[PDB]
Design a binder for these strands. Structure first.
Length: 48
RNA sequence: GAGGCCACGCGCGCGUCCCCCGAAGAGGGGGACGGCGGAGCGAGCGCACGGGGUCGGCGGCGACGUCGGCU
């Protein structure tokens, strides 16, 4: 009974920062898409 | 408005901030930043204070007198 009472009580629901940005890009997983963006920037050149 | 530095450099759209007119301080027109968004790839020569020396540098001397042998 104590386990059930506890279980039902628990289930009762209702800028830039350059140095921070570079550490984010250097992350192997968090910065994967970020450093892919800058790679395409190095290659492609487009007007406008 | 008659210099110095930057390990700052593609677009499109999204966001954040700043600017304009603002004809509801609506609605569009512009700048800056972004760590945001589903879609592949740079190669080709070199120089080196770069994961422990190499020269694609050279000279002299050599048989009955001398050459080498730290034992």
């Amino acid at each position: 009974k104590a386990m059930s009472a506890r279980a039902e009580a628990i289930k009762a629901l209702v800028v830039s920062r350059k140095l921070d940005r570079l550490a984010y890009i250097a992350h192997p997983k968090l910065g994967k898409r970020a450093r892919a963006r800058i790679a395409k920037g190095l290659r492609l050149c487009r007007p406008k």
